[PDB]
Every structure is written in C-alpha cells, then in structure tokens.
Amino acid sequence: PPPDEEEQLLAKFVFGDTTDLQENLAKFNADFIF
Amino acid sequence: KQNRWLAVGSESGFVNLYDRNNTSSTPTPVAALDQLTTTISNLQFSPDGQILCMASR
Amino acid sequence: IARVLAAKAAVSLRYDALAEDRDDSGDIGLESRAKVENRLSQLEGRDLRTT
Amino acid sequence: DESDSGDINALTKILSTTYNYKDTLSNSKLLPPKKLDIVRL
Amino acid sequence: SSLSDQLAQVASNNATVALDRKRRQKLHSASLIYNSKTAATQDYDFIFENASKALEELSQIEPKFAIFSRTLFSESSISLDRNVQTKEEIKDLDNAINAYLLLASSKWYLAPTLHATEWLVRRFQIHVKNTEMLLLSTLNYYQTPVFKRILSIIKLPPLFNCLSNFVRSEKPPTALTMIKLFNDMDFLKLYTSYLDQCIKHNATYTNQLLFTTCCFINVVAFNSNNDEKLNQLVPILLEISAKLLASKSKDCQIAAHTILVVFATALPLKKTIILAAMETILSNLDAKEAKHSALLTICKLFQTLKGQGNVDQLPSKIFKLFDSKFDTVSILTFLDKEDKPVCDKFITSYTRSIARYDRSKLNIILSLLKKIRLERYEVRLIITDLIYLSEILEDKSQLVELFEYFISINEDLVLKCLKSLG
Amino acid sequence: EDEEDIALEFINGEKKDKLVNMNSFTSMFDNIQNVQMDTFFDRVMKVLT
Numbered sequence: 221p222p223p224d225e226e227e228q229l230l231a232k233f234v235f236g237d238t239t240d241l242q243e244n245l246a247k248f249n250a251d252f253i254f
Numbered sequence: 255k256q257n258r259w260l261a262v263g264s265e266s267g268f269v270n271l272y273d274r275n276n277t278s279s280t281p282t283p284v285a286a287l288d289q290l291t292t293t294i295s296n297l298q299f300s301p302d303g304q305i306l307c308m309a310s311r
Numbered sequence: 312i313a314r315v316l317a318a319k320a321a322v323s324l325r326y327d328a329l330a331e332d333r334d335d336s337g338d339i340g341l342e343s344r345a346k347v348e349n350r351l352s353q354l355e356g357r358d359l360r361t362t
Numbered sequence: 363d364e365s366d367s368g369d370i371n372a373l374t375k376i377l378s379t380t381y382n383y384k385d386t387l388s389n390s391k392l393l394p395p396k397k398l399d400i401v402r403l
Numbered sequence: 404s405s406l407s408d409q410l411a412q413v414a415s416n417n418a419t420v421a422l423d424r425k426r427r428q429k430l431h432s433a434s435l436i437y438n439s440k441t442a443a444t445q446d447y448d449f450i451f452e453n454a455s456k457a458l459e460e461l462s463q464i465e466p467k468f469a470i471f472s473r474t475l476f477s478e479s480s481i482s483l484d485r486n487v488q489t490k491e492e493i494k495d496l497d498n499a500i501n502a503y504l505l506l507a508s509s510k511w512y513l514a515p516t517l518h519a520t521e522w523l524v525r526r527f528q529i530h531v532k533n534t535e536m537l538l539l540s541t542l543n544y545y546q547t548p549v550f551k552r553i554l555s556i557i558k559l560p561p562l563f564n565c566l567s568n569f570v571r572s573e574k575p576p577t578a579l580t581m582i583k584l585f586n587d588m589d590f591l592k593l594y595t596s597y598l599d600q601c602i603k604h605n606a607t608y609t610n611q612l613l614f615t616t617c618c619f620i621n622v623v624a625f626n627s628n629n630d631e632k633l634n635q636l637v638p639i640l641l642e643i644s645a646k647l648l649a650s651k652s653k654d655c656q657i658a659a660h661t662i663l664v665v666f667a668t669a670l671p672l673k674k675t676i677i678l679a680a681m682e683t684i685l686s687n688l689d690a691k692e693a694k695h696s697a698l699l700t701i702c703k704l705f706q707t708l709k710g711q712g713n714v715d716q717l718p719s720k721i722f723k724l725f726d727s728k729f730d731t732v733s734i735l736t737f738l739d740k741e742d743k744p745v746c747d748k749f750i751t752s753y754t755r756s757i758a759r760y761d762r763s764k765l766n767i768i769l770s771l772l773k774k775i776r777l778e779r780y781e782v783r784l785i786i787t788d789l790i791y792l793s794e795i796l797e798d799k800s801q802l803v804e805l806f807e808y809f810i811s812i813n814e815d816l817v818l819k820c821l822k823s824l825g
Numbered sequence: 826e827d828e829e830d831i832a833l834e835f836i837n838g839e840k841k842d843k844l845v846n847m848n849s850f851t852s853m854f855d856n857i858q859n860v861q862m863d864t865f866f867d868r869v870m871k872v873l874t
Binding site for chain 6: 578579581612616617621623625660665668669696703706745778779783819
C-alpha cells in the first residue's frame with residue numbers, strides 16, 4: 221500500500237529529498253508573490 | 255517698426271541688454287553678458303532681432 | 312571650509328554688532344549657513360581618484 | 363504567442379514609427395538656442 | 404589568445420566551486436553582518452537559524468515575504484548547492500532570488516533584511532552569481548553603510564566599474580559618480596529592464612522613484628551640449644515614461660511628469676510626439692496629486708513647440724479627453740492662481756479647440772482671455788477663427804461679446820484681421 | 826500689412842526661457858531624502874522656470 225502522508229514527511233527528512241523544493245522553484249511565478 | 259532690444263557696451267567688457275517693450279528711471283537689464291574681457295567696440299543686432307553680435311577690437 | 316566659514320562668519324558677525332534695529336531672529340546667518348552647506352557639498356562631492 | 367491582428371500605449375507607438383525625434387528646423391521660424399548652423403563663403 | 408587569458412575565463416566561471424580549503428575560506432568569509440575571522444568559523448545551520456527568525460519579522464511587516472519560506476528559506480535549502488544543479492534548475496533559482504531582491508529593495512533600512520539576505524549571500528552566493536540584481540536594488544542606498552558593505556564583498560560587473568574605486572574605501576560613492584554610471588547608454592537599458600520588472604510587479608516605492616528620477620534628469624543635463632547623444636537618449640528614456648505612465652501608482656506617474664518635462668526643454672520635439680505624450684498622460688490620470696502635476700506638464704510641453712501650428716487647435720479626440728479629466732472650472736482655477744507658469748500657447752490651442760468643437764462653452768472663452776494675457780500673434784489667431792464662426796455659426800450674445808472684448812482691447816488689430824478676412 | 830510683419834510679429838511674441846545646463850539639477854541629490862514626489866516635482870519646475 222502507498223505511503224501515508226505523514227510517512228512522506230519523515231521520508232523527506234530522513235533521505236533529505238529536495239524534489240519538493242525544486243518543484244516550488246519551478247512553480248515560482250513572480251506575479252503571484254506580488 | 256519699434257525696436258524691442260537695447261544693448262549698452264562698456265570698456266570692462268560687460269554688455270547690459272534691456273528689453274524696450276517692458277518705463278522707469280532705473281530699468282533692470284534682463285541679462286548681463288560678460289564673455290568678452292575687453293572693450294566692446296561694436297554692438298549690432300540681426301535685422302529680425304534674434305542675434306546680437308558683440309565684438310572687441 | 313575654514314576659509315569659507317570664516318568669511319561668512321565675519322559677515323554674520325558684523326551684522327550682529329553694528330546693526331541698529333537688529334531682529335532677534337538670526338535670518339542673515341541662516342542664509343549664510345545655506346551657502347556654506349552648499350559649498351561643502353560640491354567641494355566634498357568631488358573625487359580626486361579617476362573613475 | 364503574439365500577433366497584432368484614449369489608449370495608453372500611444373507614446374510607445376509613435377516612437378516606433380518615427381526615427382528622427384527632433385523637429386525639422388527648416389519648418390520653424392525661430393533659430394535654435396545653442397547651436398548655430400553657419401557656413402563660410 | 405594567450406594561455407593565461409583563457410585560463411582566466413575558466414577561473415571566472417569556476418569562482419564558486421570551492422575546490423580546496425583556501426577557496427572555501429574566501430567564499431565563506433564574505434558576509435554582510437560579520438567580519439572575516441568570525442565568518443570563517445560559522446556553519447550554515449547557525450546562519451540559517453538567524454535568517455529564519457529574520458524572515459519571520461519581515462513577514463509581519465509584509466506578508467509577501469512568507470512565500471520564500473517555502474522555497475529559499477526552507478530547511479531543505481541547507482543541503483541545496485548551485486554548482487551541483489542542472490542548467491534548467493538554476494534559472495528557477497535565479498528567478499526566485501530576483502523576486503526576493505525586489506521585495507527587500509524597500510526594507511534595507513530595517514535591521515532584519517540584512518540578516519535575511521545573509522542566508523542568500525552565504526548559501527546561494529548571490530554576491531558572485533546574481534551580482535547585477537543586488538547592486539540595482541540597492542543603488543539608491545549608495546550613501547548608506549549597507550551599500551558600502553555590498554561593494555566590499557562583490558566583484559563589480561563590467562557595467563558598474565564606475566564604482567571600482569569605492570570598493571573597500573572609507574568614503575561612500577559620491578552623488579556625482581552615480582550620474583556617470585547612468586550616463587552610459589548600456590546601463591540605461593539595463594536599468595530600464597530592472598525598472599520595468601518593478602512596474603509589472605507594482606514593487607515600486609517613493610525612494611526608488613525619487614532616485615531613479617534624479618539620475619535620469621541629470622543624465623539629460625549632462626548631455627545638453629551634445630545633441631547627437633540626446634537623440635540616442637530619447638528612445639530609451641521616453642519609453643520608460645510610457646511604462647511609468649501605465650502604472651496605477653500615482654508616484655510612478657509623477658516621475659514620468661518630471662522626466663518628460665526636462666526633455667521638452669532639453670530637446671525640441673515633433674508635435675506628434677508631444678501630442679502622443681498628452682494622450683498617455685491623460686489616459687491613466689486619476690489621482691488628484693498626479694492630476695495637478697499633469698496640468699503643469701501639459702502646459703510646459705506646448706511652450707517648447709516652436710513651429711508653425713504651435714498654437715493650432717488640439718485634435719478632437721485629444722480635446723474631449725482633456726475636458727473629461729479637466730473640466731472648464733478647473734482650468735479657470737489654474738488660470739486664477741497668480742503664480743501660474745507660462746501657459747499661453749496651450750490656452751491659445753485650447754481656446755481654438757472650443758470654437759471648432761464646443762459651441763456652448765463659447766462664453767468660457769471670455770473668462771479665459773481676461774484671466775491670462777495672450778501674445779499678439781495668439782490673439783490674432785483667435786480673432787481669425789472667431790470671424791469664421793460668425794459667418795458660419797449663428798450670431799450670439801456671447802459671440803458678439805467676445806468681439807466686443809476685442810473691441811475694447813487692441814481695436815486696431817481687430818480691423819486688420821477683418822480687413823484680411825472680409 | 827504683409828506676410829513678413831506676421832512673421833516678425835511671431836519673433837516679438839516668443840519669450841525667453843531658462844535653458845538646462847549641466848550644473849542645474851546637481852543639487853537635487855542633497856535633498857532627495859524623505860520628500861514626497863510632488864514636492865520634488867515642484868522644485869524641478871522651479872529650477873526650470
């Protein structure tokens with residue numbers, strides 16, 4: 221069965237994943253911040 | 255036609271320019287040219303009144 | 312600046328001492344203060360080093 | 363993404379069409395202030 | 404090219420790799436809060452801890468900063484390195500950095516911003532990679548101590564070498580040199596692009612507009628003697644004026660009012676450019692304070708016109724637009740104030756436009772002429788048009804009164820126009 | 826009356842203006858701190874007038 225959300229958080233911390241961050245950078249649209 | 259400019263020379267090189275169109279015992283000159291440093295021996299306007307040629311011999 | 316401030320110091324002073332109906336306002340000095348402040352700005356604004 | 367197919371963008375348009383931004387001095391009947399167009403004979 | 408020259412280009416590309424310990428010391432030593440010796444001793448975790456708190460304070464001042472908490476100031480950002488990423492990823496990082504430098508542009512006076520930017524300087528080496536955006540955002544603080552620190556830790560781009568002297572120098576850069584940096588055209592295109600980004604994001608603030616205005620005005624003055632350069636300046640700076648006028652923010656428009664006026668006096672322009680300028684000015688004129696500044700700008704522009712038709716009537720579209728943003732009562736109030744600027748040519752044009760287009764305002768012509776003394780040539784043009792009006796338009800009490808006014812003052816000129824016309 | 830008199834009547838009509846020189850807006854930098862844009866707008870006119 222697929223991982224629970226709270227697992228994905230620990231998995232993010234333990235393995236030090238940065239795919240979540242790189243996604244936000246890609247989604248970063250300047251007009252949205254302004 | 256009536257003249258609208260008046261220029262008065264001077265040995266020191268100053269040339270005081272007076273606007274005839276605008277009377278008093280003491281009139282204030284519009285400008286006080288001093289580029290020359292010697293006696294003004296010629297003062298002459300262009301026929302239409304847009305250039306003043308000041309010279310020192 | 313010492314030369315500029317002293318020269319304007321004399322002018323402001325000679326008005327204080329020798330004025331008959333001087334007002335207690337200091338108007339002449341304030342105008343003198345502006346001229347020194349302007350003279351300081353352009354004097355300091357210059358740079359000796361080539362840019 | 364782009365195709366052409368009082369408006370605010372009037373000024374930017376008139377800049378595009380014109381190359382010479384200084385009015386011709388031949389038409390005017392006052393001479394320019396600081397520059398003299400003088401030729402020797 | 405010599406071997407040394409090519410290797411230099413390799414070094415410049417490879418500036419932030421941190422290949423060996425000595426390189427790691429120079430890179431890690433650069434700082435905006437701390438001296439060199441302490442800087443070498445610190446770790447990324449300690450630096451990030453301060454920034455996380457500092458960003459929180461900025462968030463309270465302005466909610467927009469909270470977004471970067473998810474991207475640049477996240478706990479994952481500690482492990483993030485730029486040298487290891489791909490070309491596509493670094494562009495997104497550069498875009499995120501550039502957006503942040505815009506928000507922090509106005510809050511440099513506050514203490515927390517200087518902490519928050521430390522995280523980017525240490526982690527993302529913006530002082531080496533995003534050098535241009537950092538200097539441009541902090542250009543107006545040139546006398547502030549913060550700007551001095553920025554110079555010391557930053558390698559100047561080719562365009563900013565005017566500041567090369569003021570790196571690690573006690574005196575801050577003088578006002579005069581900033582004019583030199585703006586004087587080069589290439590910088591203006593660069594600054595124009597940065598300024599354009601601010602308008603798109605509505606990130607502008609008064610201090611930036613004041614400083615941006617003061618430099619642009621001065622650049623024209625420094626180029627007053629050289630006509631050919633002034634010609635090259637018009638495409639760039641007037642284009643900025645169109646963008647500033649597009650902005651809703653009033654202070655942006657007023658800066659456009661400053662910058663337009665100085666060209667008009669600095670360089671005579673074609674009427675079409677002048678007329679085009681009015682429409683842009685009047686399109687977005689909503690703020691009262693901008694409204695006052697606009698009317699002075701309109702009058703000042705026409706005074707610079709020195710060609711045939713200088714006092715010709717405005718085009719119909721321009722006339723309707725002007726009256727919408729300035730009713731007849733307003734301009735009479737403008738004509739009232741004793742300290743008015745010279746506006747005779749515009750009023751002559753605005754006068755003739757009424758006769759052509761709006762008959763019922765013809766009474767207002769009487770009031771306008773009395774308030775301001777118009778030039779003789781202007782009055783002659785007004786008489787000539789009103790003569791045609793009587794032949795075409797039906798005779799009116801106001802119409803004859805306008806003549807009757809001209810009868811009272813300078814009667815002889817009235818005959819001359821009538822003699823030439825009828 | 827003649828056409829020339831109309832032309833000569835323009836030249837009298839035109840009025841003097843203060844040209845912009847290099848050392849005309851230099852002082853702005855000194856007092857460009859904590860001033861609303863509108864005040865700065867007026868001063869530019871003042872030197873220009």
